[PDB]
RNA sequence: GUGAAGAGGGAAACAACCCAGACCGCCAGCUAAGGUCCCAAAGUCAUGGUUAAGUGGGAAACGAUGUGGGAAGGCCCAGAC
RNA sequence: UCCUCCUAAAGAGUAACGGAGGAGCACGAAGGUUGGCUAAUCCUGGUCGGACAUCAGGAGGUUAGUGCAAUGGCAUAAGCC
RNA sequence: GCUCAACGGAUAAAAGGUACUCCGGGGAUAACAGGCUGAUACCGCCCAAGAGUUCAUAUCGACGGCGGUGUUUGGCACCU
RNA sequence: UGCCUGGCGGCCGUAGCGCGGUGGUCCCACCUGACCCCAUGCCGAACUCAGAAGUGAAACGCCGUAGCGCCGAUGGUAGUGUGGGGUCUCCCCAUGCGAGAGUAGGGAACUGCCAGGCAA
């Protein structure tokens, strides 16, 4: 065969889903590009990894001019 | 169109400043007149607002649209802001280059007592 | 150009197929300010009716519960390969 | 022999020819050869069935071909073991579900149409039927 | 108001969820007339394994 | 899911298919799959049709006034086939 | 050995001598931050100058660009200054 | 300070021959035969563009299509 | 109370395009000017400052229109969870869920605080 190669899988996705209680610093979404965006009390690291900046429940929203998915946290 | 280029030039400040959840002092400049308003951290409701369009301030000045007028507004806003109970604020220049009238407004707002 | 037609009570995939496998097929009447009306009717008549070119142009008066409703055949669903009708949309 | 002029990928998965067809109504011509059965028509079969039609109706009339291959079929050579790569693309096929109009015809009589579609229908693996363009 | 449920089929060649559902109803063997309190849940449990249980 | 590591009844015989999970005993009764004229436990059961090929009891393209149902479409008393 | 896509059956994971491509670096500015900016490709007019160099206006709007594959992402621009 | 790239790296340091061979094992794995399969092979059939002085179906039958057989080349590795 | 502007949101196409309009007393715009503040990899075009002769052209705001975009039932269809079945590459049946596309139709956004002018 000419090919027969592949990389190791990266385990990317929504780790904590909407409504779930998360602790301050908990990773909510591992992904490549900002598919989801950082809302209230949610960060965005160098890897575009969205993480909780406060102890609370995760909230998925669909707002903005371009209709993007945002992840917020509400205590 | 110019306006639309000024809105997007401002947006980065606004969207960064609403994330922090800070009370922003918006300053809309115009060839004739200058405006200024202290807006609540939510962004919807206004707490304090003043301008050269207000007759109370317009009656005093020579011409409404210059550095000496901007100071008269900048003083007026910060004079109200302290009476309401506001002190710690942010300054949203609103896509206007921080140099002339807006600087004269900002420095007057600092010299009046408003803390930023 | 007059056909007697019953009112539907069961409606879905289970009912429709049971109906279609009983010499009949489902249709619907709709238009104007009134609510839509789901209408069961016989196959062998309406199959012979569609051969005439007037069917897809002229006004048909469908008889339901005594009342005669005036309609035009807007849209229609043929069975993929077998020569038979699945469903008709009667605009008012 | 019909084939895509350049594609993204050379070799395609086998897949599963399921469901009903979409190109069901007779759109362009007056008559049409509808596929009753399920199957897959090769590039050769389509040409062979076209030649059988076009020669029956002579120079007159107009014919369409609603189906096109765009699916490469691979085949492993003779005296070759399993594995050691996906086989080489030999021929091209169009997957045909039930209901799919294959050929369409116009500018001929109804009497002479059916006879022309029999000659094509004989060439094809799939069981077919005659269909007329009904107005809505 | 209670409802009498009876197991009328074996729980051998069944899905783990259907193996669970009978453990949630409390049915052990075929021909076990277990009666339970009628709620929206228990009717759902019966609806999940309706093929192998009978209601009185 | 089953076997592996699960016997028992059925699929003629048939680890994995259908039914069903053997603690031990009894010359008790009710059922599952599957069956009920004889080999062999139980319907030569009841009613309404189909089949004439021993189909049932291996198979395709295609072929044919086989034979049942239907829903239509061509003509009569000026008498069509 | 490492990265990307599909196979992978709408969380993650998932094989084959299955299907296609890349990497063994680059950069004291290509980092930081502040303040700005907006693209492709055409149309018409214009010296040498022509399809295309540079200019003007109009059209399209992210087909662009992203130090390198592929993926996801970016006008608040992560783009170019 | 290592293409320790056979990239969880056996040593700092390593290629071949055996038909002169031997021991331990395997039908976990090939060569013969069997089996399952039937791409290929063989054997039929379906449509009819043409040849045949004219005339498709006396005899051939292109383009295509559908089966059988287990007779060839194969595949698989289920028995030994 | 209302009618007109501006500022900042909420909501992101029923909210956007085009076309047809109409508005200048303030509001906004161009416009005026270029020691001073500042600006151009050239250029007061841009950004900036000092202004008040002009206009509502352009840009903007408001009213009007379906040419598009956009929203979108009911019914059917596809698909599919579970237990069955068949003539088993593919279907079908009971029961649960149930699209997408199209169709009737909808459809020139709806608002929040705050400021100014005018009829009160
Ligand atoms: Mg991957
Ligand atoms: Mg993988
Ligand atoms: Mg808890
Ligand atoms: Mg960081
Ligand atoms: Mg419904
Ligand atoms: Mg169903
Ligand atoms: Mg109406
Ligand atoms: Mg081509
Ligand atoms: Mg699939
Ligand atoms: Mg499709
Ligand atoms: Mg289509
Ligand atoms: Mg090879
Ligand atoms: Mg009991
Ligand atoms: Mg009991
Ligand atoms: Mg063992
Ligand atoms: Mg057993
Ligand atoms: Mg047994
Ligand atoms: Mg036995
Ligand atoms: Mg048997
Ligand atoms: Mg066996
Ligand atoms: Mg046995
Ligand atoms: Mg059973
Ligand atoms: Mg048990
Ligand atoms: Mg058990
Ligand atoms: Mg037991
Ligand atoms: Mg015992
Ligand atoms: Mg009893
Ligand atoms: Mg008994
Ligand atoms: Mg039985
Ligand atoms: Mg029997
Ligand atoms: Mg016997
Ligand atoms: Mg026996
Ligand atoms: Mg007996
Ligand atoms: Mg007798
Ligand atoms: Mg009898
Ligand atoms: Mg009889
Ligand atoms: Mg039979
Ligand atoms: Mg036979
Ligand atoms: Mg036949
Ligand atoms: Mg016949
Ligand atoms: Mg008969
Ligand atoms: Mg008959
Ligand atoms: Mg009869
Ligand atoms: Mg009848
Ligand atoms: Mg009759
Ligand atoms: Mg590895
Ligand atoms: Mg995909
Ligand atoms: Mg996947
Ligand atoms: Mg996945
Ligand atoms: Mg999955
Ligand atoms: Mg793991
Ligand atoms: Mg595995
Ligand atoms: Mg792999
Ligand atoms: Mg390589
Ligand atoms: Mg330096
Ligand atoms: Mg730089
Ligand atoms: Mg930098
Ligand atoms: Mg500076
Ligand atoms: Mg910047
Ligand atoms: Mg691009
Ligand atoms: Mg990309
Ligand atoms: Mg640069
Ligand atoms: Mg090293
Ligand atoms: Mg090694
Ligand atoms: Mg090595
Ligand atoms: Mg290794
Ligand atoms: Mg590894
Ligand atoms: Mg090693
Ligand atoms: Mg030897
Ligand atoms: Mg030897
Ligand atoms: Mg020796
Ligand atoms: Mg030995
Ligand atoms: Mg092995
Ligand atoms: Mg041999
Ligand atoms: Mg052998
Ligand atoms: Mg055999
Ligand atoms: Mg065999
Ligand atoms: Mg064969
Ligand atoms: Mg023959
Ligand atoms: Mg023949
Ligand atoms: Mg012959
Ligand atoms: Mg045969
Ligand atoms: Mg043999
Ligand atoms: Mg073996
Ligand atoms: Mg094996
Ligand atoms: Mg043996
Ligand atoms: Mg435009
Ligand atoms: Mg506009
Ligand atoms: Mg006027
Ligand atoms: Mg100027
Ligand atoms: Mg004037
Ligand atoms: Mg004026
Ligand atoms: Mg105008
Ligand atoms: Mg408007
Ligand atoms: Mg309308
Ligand atoms: Mg909407
Ligand atoms: Mg839509
Ligand atoms: Mg929408
Ligand atoms: Mg709906
Ligand atoms: Mg409704
Ligand atoms: Mg529906
Ligand atoms: Mg399903
Ligand atoms: Mg099932
Ligand atoms: Mg059954
Ligand atoms: Mg829904
Ligand atoms: Mg819908
Ligand atoms: Mg739609
Ligand atoms: Mg469409
Ligand atoms: Mg329409
Ligand atoms: Mg209405
Ligand atoms: Mg209308
Ligand atoms: Mg509109
Ligand atoms: Mg409009
Ligand atoms: Mg309006
Ligand atoms: Mg209206
Ligand atoms: Mg709305
Ligand atoms: Mg409005």
XYZ file of C-alpha atoms in Angstrom, chain D residues 56-133:
78
model
C -34.513 2.065 -33.322
C -35.989 5.585 -33.611
C -33.472 6.539 -36.396
C -32.187 10.153 -36.850
C -35.542 11.605 -35.657
C -36.517 12.261 -32.026
C -34.577 13.460 -28.975
C -33.148 11.333 -26.131
C -31.932 12.232 -22.616
C -29.854 10.166 -20.174
C -30.968 11.059 -16.633
C -28.466 8.625 -15.017
C -24.675 9.091 -14.928
C -21.994 6.766 -13.415
C -19.735 8.904 -11.083
C -18.967 5.832 -8.903
C -15.739 3.934 -9.649
C -15.810 0.162 -9.156
C -12.518 -1.490 -8.295
C -11.533 -5.036 -9.204
C -8.696 -7.226 -7.962
C -6.674 -9.060 -10.663
C -6.790 -12.833 -11.242
C -4.450 -15.017 -9.114
C -4.091 -12.288 -6.446
C -4.337 -12.799 -2.668
C -6.437 -10.731 -0.266
C -5.148 -7.466 1.187
C -2.064 -5.554 0.009
C -4.224 -2.548 -0.980
C -7.554 -1.537 -2.497
C -7.960 -2.834 -6.060
C -7.685 -0.836 -9.287
C -10.700 1.006 -10.769
C -11.958 -1.042 -13.742
C -15.399 0.352 -14.619
C -17.830 3.082 -13.548
C -21.398 2.523 -12.310
C -24.543 4.516 -11.497
C -26.477 3.202 -8.480
C -30.162 2.799 -9.384
C -32.898 2.714 -6.751
C -36.539 1.888 -7.560
C -38.425 4.774 -9.211
C -35.410 6.299 -11.013
C -36.041 7.532 -14.565
C -33.127 6.279 -16.693
C -33.890 7.498 -20.211
C -36.313 10.080 -21.531
C -37.548 10.522 -25.105
C -39.340 13.214 -27.145
C -40.588 13.883 -30.691
C -41.772 10.352 -31.555
C -45.054 8.367 -31.581
C -46.313 6.458 -28.503
C -46.547 3.274 -30.618
C -42.919 3.490 -31.808
C -41.622 4.707 -28.397
C -42.458 1.537 -26.394
C -40.727 -0.674 -28.980
C -37.573 1.497 -28.755
C -37.563 1.240 -24.930
C -38.002 -2.573 -25.057
C -34.745 -2.845 -27.044
C -32.961 -0.747 -24.381
C -34.725 -2.499 -21.466
C -33.381 -5.795 -22.861
C -29.764 -4.529 -22.527
C -30.146 -3.485 -18.869
C -29.901 -5.762 -15.770
C -32.620 -3.878 -13.858
C -36.335 -4.515 -14.438
C -37.866 -1.414 -16.072
C -41.209 0.135 -17.086
C -42.604 2.781 -19.469
C -43.768 6.133 -18.007
C -45.494 9.136 -19.640
C -45.099 12.798 -18.619
